[PDB]
């Protein structure tokens, strides 16, 4: 076959992976991977062009990002602006793209039956784009809003500060429109020139995943990508920075320039060194810095020419000891030089990656195709699956080679802290970031180059947590499709399901510990939290090995008590669990740690002011709608009465009375489940003298019930971001089969029209979201928007949209209606693809205490019965502006600066303004809880 340079059929894969794979290279030079998965619900494709922002024209910063936007807005064969995205939406799909420095990546997914259709449309992007004239003037605004949202984010400012000291890759209105106009530059022509010059077939990689045979996929990709053109396009210090952040954060970033290690994939020297320097076990860098009271966290490793980084957060004491911190880093590195490369370590890493690969979790299709699409430019067809996991050559010379770059003489150090506020003299141009730059004194350098051996630093030791028993226990005779309650006592309820799907030797063990004293008042909530933070900080050293060994855990405070999840290989899981609970029940608090963690928590309470407007809106709606909720402010205030004595006294009391609800799910037997449950119970009894809680003490909170025909608005100002956010909530009623499918069908139907009208056409903002809101057994319809436009306008536009939608639902045909039905049906019936997603589903059924495990089938069966009439009258009853049962609440978050045709917006009534949340709550009824 003339069209194929070569076919590499065998492609090394995990033996758990039943998908099939075929690699080829087309005539025009494109590398392709094909993936057949006859089980899959969604198909997916991705395309990665090995060009990105580093290749922008010097006079038009941001051009390639802009191009990435422009490819989506129409082709010769499909000229409708959103034919592509509407198709996707109408076929259970979605799509996105990103631009990195050396890559541009476009990917989508879709219902498995319309792959070919999506793909045909997708193919057109690379053959003929319209670059519509009208699309351009709007979309430069889309790009501008993208940058606007990020402006006051700390990470982006650090990112760009490091790069500037150098192009600005993102672009904005200035760089993409204003400045080019001023300088006689035609931007459309430039786009055309860039597209023609750099979007060469030879720089492309495609991956496609679908239900189709490997042969059918082959023909699809041959057909649609053979015709791309191939025009042989060649592939293209000692400074200190003191930076003022937006949030109150304290960090130190240390970075060393290194060569591009990508080609060393068979050894991965940067990962070896990252592994070693980034360790959190006994003997480690972090362990010393933390003992010294200087740091809470450390990350080390390679960052994308390339860099090697080591970043840490800072306690109050640390901020004044940055120089010594760095001295220790250099001592540890010197330790690594002195001992030289270690074959045994490499062998462990190689083994752990091998095991991780054999039992890797099945990926979400979109991510898998996108990721592989990215990495096909770097690896032979046959190795693309394993290249990122499988180490093969031990190469101590490369490891040493990279170690030679981690020297005080090519170091860059950046400190981010509010303490530099006012003490700075430079301003970064694009984001406005205030900072000072200074030469590191040669004497400090000299001292570091002479970093001595301390002995407080040891290599880690053998990881004893490495699992070695992988037997999959056989499926029980009496197995059931949903979790079963296999133990029901005063102290504890145990739900259990043996895995009958995934067949990896893993499990998830979840426990809610209920106690009323965890949330009785702000002080107790603060204490519960500080307690759990202290416990995790103290377990960290021991737990880290386990985490490397595919055993992790999550421990956090909730409104009901405490939450514990242990996941991973079950070979060693009860050992970790036993250490956690035993330490939980016998915890002794170190004072220094208490002061440090308390201070960190104080700052995190403060940092809420710098969240996004829409995060604020969700937060306040949450406060408004829940019977009891403590604000971040109240917690902060209450935080000062937390002393060591008080916490020490609180802990035994918190544990003194409990109820435990658990879901144990994975590769474990009933006897082993009962065993684990009983181990927990007995440990708690032994060490904390726990007794059962009374049935009557199991309070769940209710949701405020809004009055018929009312509209309430709650308004607040964001002090940090110069955008606004709004959330609009139409509360409907309690959950039940029909109300749920009415709301869900409506959300499904209005889902894509809203994006296309409110964002793509009317450009109300970057963030435009809609959908069901479910809390506390109640539900309703919500809208979330973040915008430059004032809230009252957003309101009027959403209301006009809702009317457009009613008219549109009336006017639509039987078949289109059934298409919406069929699409909702597929969405609802989507099987979880990996263990922890199924666990999440069951846990959701359990924590709400609705226990409707077969809800998806009942509701979909019922869904198929519904007609236009039903939805029209639902809408008329619950949603329309003059609906007898309208219940509308709105949260307005004003921009810092903000003050306190188009289809036709209806006249709206005067809203009632909420002055004080507590009064609002006191003055309204509460819903029931949902019956189990």
């Amino acid at each position: 076959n003339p069209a194929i340079k070569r076919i590499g059929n065998h492609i090394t894969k995990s033996p758990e992976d039943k998908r099939e794979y075929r690699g080829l290279e087309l005539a025009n030079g494109i590398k392709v991977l094909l993936i057949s998965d006859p089980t899959t619900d969604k198909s997916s494709a991705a395309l990665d062009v090995h060009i990105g922002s580093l290749s922008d024209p010097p006079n038009i910063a941001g051009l390639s990002h802009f191009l990435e936007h422009m490819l989506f807005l129409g082709t010769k064969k499909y000229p409708k602006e959103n034919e592509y995205s509407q198709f996707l939406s109408e076929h259970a799909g979605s799509s996105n793209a990103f631009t990195s420095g050396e890559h541009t990546n476009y990917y989508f997914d879709v219902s498995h039956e319309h792959l070919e259709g999506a793909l045909d449309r997708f193919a057109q992007f690379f053959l003929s784009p319209l670059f519509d004239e009208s699309a351009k003037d709007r979309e430069v605004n889309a790009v501008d809003s993208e940058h606007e949202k990020n402006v006051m984010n700390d990470a982006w400012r650090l990112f760009q500060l490091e790069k500037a000291t150098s192009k600005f890759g993102t672009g904005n209105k200035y760089t993409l429109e204003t400045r080019p106009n001023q300088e006689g530059i035609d931007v459309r022509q430039e786009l055309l020139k860039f597209h023609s010059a750099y979007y060469s077939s030879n720089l492309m990689a495609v991956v496609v995943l679908g239900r189709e045979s490997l042969d059918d996929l082959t023909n699809l990709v041959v057909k649609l990508f053979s015709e791309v053109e191939n025009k042989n396009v060649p592939l293209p210090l000692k400074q200190l920075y003191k930076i003022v952040p937006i949030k109150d954060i304290r960090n130190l970033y240390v970075t060393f320039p290194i060569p591009d290690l990508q080609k060393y994939y068979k050894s991965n020297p940067g990962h070896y060194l990252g592994h070693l320097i980034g360790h959190e076990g006994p003997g480690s860098l972090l362990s010393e810095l933390k003992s010294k009271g200087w740091v809470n966290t450390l990350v080390g490793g390679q960052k994308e020419f390339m860099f090697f980084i080591i970043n840490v957060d800072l306690t109050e004491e640390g901020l004044l000891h940055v120089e010594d911190i760095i001295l220790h880093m250099f001592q540890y590195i010197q330790k690594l030089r002195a001992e030289g490369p270690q074959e045994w370590v490499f062998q462990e890493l190689k083994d752990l990656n091998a095991v991780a690969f054999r039992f890797k979790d099945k990926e979400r299709p979109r991510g898998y195709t996108s990721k592989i699409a990215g990495i096909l430019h770097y690896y032979p067809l046959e190795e693309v699956l394993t290249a990122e996991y499988l180490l093969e050559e031990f190469r101590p010379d490369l490891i040493e080679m990279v170690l030679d770059k981690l020297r005080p003489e090519n170091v860059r150090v950046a400190i981010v802290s509010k303490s530099f506020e006012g003490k700075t003299d430079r301003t970064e141009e694009w984001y406005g970031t205030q900072y000072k730059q200074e030469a590191i004194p040669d004497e400090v350098i000299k001292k570091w180059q002479n970093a001595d051996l301390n002995g407080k630093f040891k290599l880690p030791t053998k990881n004893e947590f490495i699992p070695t028993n992988f037997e999959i226990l056989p499926l029980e005779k009496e197995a059931t499709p949903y979790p079963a309650l296999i133990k029901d006592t005063a102290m504890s309820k145990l739900w259990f399901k043996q895995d009958d799907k995934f067949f990896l030797p893993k499990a998830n063990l979840n426990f809610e510990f209920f106690s009323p004293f965890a949330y009785v008042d702000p002080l107790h909530s603060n204490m519960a939290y500080l307690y759990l933070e202290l416990l995790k900080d103290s377990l960290n050293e021991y737990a880290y090995a386990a985490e490397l060994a595919g055993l992790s855990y999550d421990l956090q405070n909730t409104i009901y008590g405490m939450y514990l999840s242990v996941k991973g290989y079950n070979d060693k899981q009860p050992i970790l669990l036993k250490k956690i609970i035993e330490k939980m029940a016998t915890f002794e608090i170190d004072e220094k740690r208490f002061e440090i963690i308390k201070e960190a928590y104080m700052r995190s309470l403060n940092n809420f002011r710098a969240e996004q407007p829409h995060q604020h809106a969700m937060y306040y709606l949450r406060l408004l709608m829940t019977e009891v909720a403590w604000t971040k402010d109240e917690l902060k205030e209450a935080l000062d009465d937390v002393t060591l004595p008080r916490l020490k006294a609180f802990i035994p009391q918190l544990l003194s009375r409990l109820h435990i609800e658990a879901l144990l799910h994975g590769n474990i037997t009933k006897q082993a489940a009962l065993g684990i449950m009983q181990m927990v119970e007995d440990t708690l009894i032994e060490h904390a003298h726990t007794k059962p809680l009374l049935p009557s003490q199991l309070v769940r909170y209710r949701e405020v019930q809004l009055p018929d025909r009312g509209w309430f608005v709650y308004q607040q100002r964001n002090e940090v971001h110069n955008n606004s956010g709004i959330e609009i909530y139409y509360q409907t009623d309690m959950q039940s089969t029909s109300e749920n499918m009415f709301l869900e069908l409506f959300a499904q139907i209005i889902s894509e029209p809203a994006f296309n009208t409110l964002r793509t056409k009317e450009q109300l903002g970057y963030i435009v979201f809609s959908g069901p809101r479910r809390a506390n057994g109640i539900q309703g319809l919500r809208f979330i928007i973040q915008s430059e436009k004032p809230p009252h306008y957003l309101e009027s536009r959403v209301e006009a949209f809702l009317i457009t939608m009613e008219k549109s639902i009336e006017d639509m045909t039987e078949e289109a209606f059934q298409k919406h039905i069929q699409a909702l049906a597929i969405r609802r019936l989507d099987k979880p693809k990996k263990l922890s997603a199924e666990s999440a589903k069951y846990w959701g059924e359990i924590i709400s205490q609705q226990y409707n495990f077969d809800r998806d089938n009942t509701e979909v069966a019922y869904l198929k019965t519904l007609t236009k009439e039903d939805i029209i009258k639902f809408y008329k009853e619950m949603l329309a502006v003059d609906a007898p049962r309208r219940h509308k609440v709105s949260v307005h978050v004003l921009a810092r600066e903000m003050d306190s045709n188009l289809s036709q917006a209806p006249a709206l009534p005067q809203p009632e303004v909420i002055q004080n949340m507590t009064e609002f709550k006191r003055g309204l009824p509460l819903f029931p809880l949902v019956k189990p």
Epitope: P396, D397, E400, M401
Partner: antibody, heavy 127, light 102 residues
Framework: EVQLVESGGGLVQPGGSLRLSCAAS????????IHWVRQAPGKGLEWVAS????????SYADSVKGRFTISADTNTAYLQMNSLRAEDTAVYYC??????????????????????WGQGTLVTVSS | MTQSPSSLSASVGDRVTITCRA????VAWYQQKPGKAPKLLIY???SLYSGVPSRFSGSRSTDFTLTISSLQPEDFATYYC??????????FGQGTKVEIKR
């Protein structure tokens, strides 16, 4: 099919000059290391010089320091002999490193093999 | 640095062992037939090059040792133990001449 070729050997009046060429084929000299190893007549294997063209590094034997030069054009390597003593008469072989991107600068050396050698050229030096 | 011995002699089918004593704590092996260029036998002091007879093993007791268990009639050549050291330096031994024994 990887392979090497040596060329330039002949008969040179002592204190003369010669330029050998290790014509490479099947791989790029840029990301491999080219060694030059001369055997005497009836004596043992002796190493002369080497070059890592990626790290642009070179290395010569203490037998010849300011009388030899190893360089390479990226697809051949060239050993340049200057003022050749009567004892430099021998057979020179040139090999490459089995592993790519060997790091020249090192503290502990790692004996990787050399998988592909040339079949040498014999330079005879006598007046 | 050194090798042992000057040479070795033995029958076909016999067991020959060469010891090369040597920073760099490894060693590689080459088999040279009289006249031709050297041939690579073992690279990591343990593992052998690709497409080499399985009868060549690299061992270590300290000293390093190449071993020919089922010596054939075409494995009668000179054997070189090489080192690679700091400073980009290469170094071979004086050669082990394996001779056939009548």
């Amino acid at each position: 099919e990887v392979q090497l070729v040596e060329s330039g050997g002949g008969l040179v009046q002592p204190g003369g000059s010669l330029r050998l060429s290790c014509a490479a084929s099947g791989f790029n000299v840029s990301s491999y290391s080219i060694h030059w190893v001369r055997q005497a007549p009836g004596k043992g294997l002796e190493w002369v010089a080497s070059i890592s063209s990626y790290y642009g590094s070179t290395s010569y034997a203490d037998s010849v320091k300011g009388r030899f030069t190893i360089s390479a054009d990226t697809n051949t390597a060239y050993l340049q002999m200057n003022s050749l003593r009567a004892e430099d008469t021998a057979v020179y072989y040139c090999a490459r490193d089995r592993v790519m991107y060997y790091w020249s600068f090192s503290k502990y050396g790692y004996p990787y093999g050399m998988d592909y050698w040339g079949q040498g050229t014999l330079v005879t030096v006598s007046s | 640095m050194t090798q042992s011995p000057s040479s070795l002699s033995a029958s076909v089918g016999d067991r020959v062992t060469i010891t090369c004593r040597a920073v760099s704590s490894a060693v590689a092996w080459y088999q040279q037939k009289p006249g031709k260029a050297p041939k690579l036998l073992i690279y990591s002091t343990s593992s052998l090059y690709s497409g080499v007879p399985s009868r060549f093993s690299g061992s270590r007791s300290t000293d390093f040792t190449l071993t020919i268990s089922s010596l054939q009639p075409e494995d009668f050549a000179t054997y070189y133990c090489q080192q690679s050291s700091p400073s980009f330096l290469i170094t071979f031994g004086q050669g082990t001449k394996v001779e056939i024994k009548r």
